Amino acid sequence: XXXXXXXXXXXXXXXXXXXXXXXXXXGYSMFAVGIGALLFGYWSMMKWNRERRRLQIEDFEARIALMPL
Amino acid sequence: MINILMLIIPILLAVAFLTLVERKVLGYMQLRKGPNVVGPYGLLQPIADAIKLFIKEPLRPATSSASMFILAPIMALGLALTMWIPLPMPYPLINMNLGVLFMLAMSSLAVYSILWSGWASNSKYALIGALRAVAQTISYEVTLAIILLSVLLMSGSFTLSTLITTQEQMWLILPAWPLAMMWFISTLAETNRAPFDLGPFALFFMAEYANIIMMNIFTAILFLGTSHNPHMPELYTINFTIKSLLLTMSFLWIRASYPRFRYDQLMHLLWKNFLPLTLALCMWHVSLPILTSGIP
Numbered sequence: 001x002x003x004x005x006x007x008x009x010x011x012x013x014x015x016x017x018x019x020x021x022x023x024x025x026x027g028y029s030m031f032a033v034g035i036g037a038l039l040f041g042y043w044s045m046m047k048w049n050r051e052r053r054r055l056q057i058e059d060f061e062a063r064i065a066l067m068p069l
Numbered sequence: 070m071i072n073i074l075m076l077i078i079p080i081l082l083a084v085a086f087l088t089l090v091e092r093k094v095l096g097y098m099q100l101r102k103g104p105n106v107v108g109p110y111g112l113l114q115p116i117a118d119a120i121k122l123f124i125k126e127p128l129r130p131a132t133s134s135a136s137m138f139i140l141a142p143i144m145a146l147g148l149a150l151t152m153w154i155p156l157p158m159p160y161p162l163i164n165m166n167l168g169v170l171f172m173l174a175m176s177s178l179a180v181y182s183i184l185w186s187g188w189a190s191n192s193k194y195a196l197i198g199a200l201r202a203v204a205q206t207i208s209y210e211v212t213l214a215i216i217l218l219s220v221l222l223m224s225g226s227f228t229l230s231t232l233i234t235t236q237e238q239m240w241l242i243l244p245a246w247p248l249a250m251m252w253f254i255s256t257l258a259e260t261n262r263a264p265f266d267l268g269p270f271a272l273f274f275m276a277e278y279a280n281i282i283m284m285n286i287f288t289a290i291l292f293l294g295t296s297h298n299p300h301m302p303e304l305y306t307i308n309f310t311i312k313s314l315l316l317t318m319s320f321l322w323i324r325a326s327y328p329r330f331r332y333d334q335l336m337h338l339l340w341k342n343f344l345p346l347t348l349a350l351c352m353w354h355v356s357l358p359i360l361t362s363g364i365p
Binding site: 034037038040041042044045046048049050052053056 | 223224235237238239243244245246357358361362363364365
């Protein structure tokens with residue numbers, strides 16, 4: 001009996017298949033989150049600066065109140 | 070005054086122990102094993118590099134022009150270590166009257182370190198490439214000043230201690246969304262060798278990698294904060310280090326993942342494209358405290 005190297009292909013490994021595809025981001029939907037984070041960013045920040053004004057006037061009031069200084 | 074030595078010696082160790090991180094974290098990116106033979110996980114190698122280069126390695130200068138070449142590493146290491154002083158941290162060492170102005174000043178003088186090295190060599194062959202390396206740093210410092218001012222004009226004065234207090238509930242990444250993207254790129258220009266790349270030669274490594282940690286920390290003040298807590302210094306110290314370490318991973322991410330942008334097209338990303346974008350956002354950041362009340 002002769003024994004040589006046997007042939008096997010099975011699945012053929014798929015000859016040239018695309019793996020690159022669009023994922024997560026679509027296009028217009030990313031701008032809704034992108035610019036949406038900006039509008040949420042300013043509104044949250046400016047409310048803190050209005051709360052800073054409560055401290056600001058109260059800080060300068062200490063100088064006016066102190067005349068024996 | 071003992072704390073100055075407690076901000077040079079552990080910092081020089083941090084630049085030394087970077088050699089582990091700069092090729093093990095970079096190693097797993099490239100599917101290679103970094104340090105392993107030298108130590109238990111290669112912890113003995115960072116200190117072993119110091120014994121190799123400092124003591125035994127001799128000098129062979131090209132011309133040695135009296136004062137220079139043995140003055141350029143002093144300007145390199147000196148300016149890199151003095152940048153640690155104005156840093157806010159939980160508590161700063163000798164807090165300046167204005168914080169960020171000292172930060173931009175010592176970085177703009179750190180351009181000299183690569184300038185005097187070009188003058189050290191007598192040959193014309195080296196100085197053309199040396200001036201090209203100056204152009205990589207000098208150009209990005211124009212925008213670096215602009216993006217700084219836009220963050221400051223939102224909230225706080227130049228003082229670095231006030232920048233921690235303004236970030237009480239939310240980070241500055243969300244209001245400054247395109248500006249946060251800029252600090253990932255602009256910092257890499259200062260001899261990081263990720264978008265563009267050009268005894269005493271070993272001392273430049275100890276200074277250039279020191280600026281990498283410096284830009285990681287400075288980004289974690291302008292954009293990160295989470296909490297302050299004056300009563301508990303324990304909670305701030307641990308939480309600040311993790312935030313800075315995550316930015317250190319992103320600095321080594323660009324070095325491995327992305328090719329060089331070319332010197333000519335580095336001036337097409339910036340100047341041609343970035344400078345119209347940064348100033349338009351600077352125009353936007355002038356109107357913000359006027360449109361809605363936001364003055365420190």
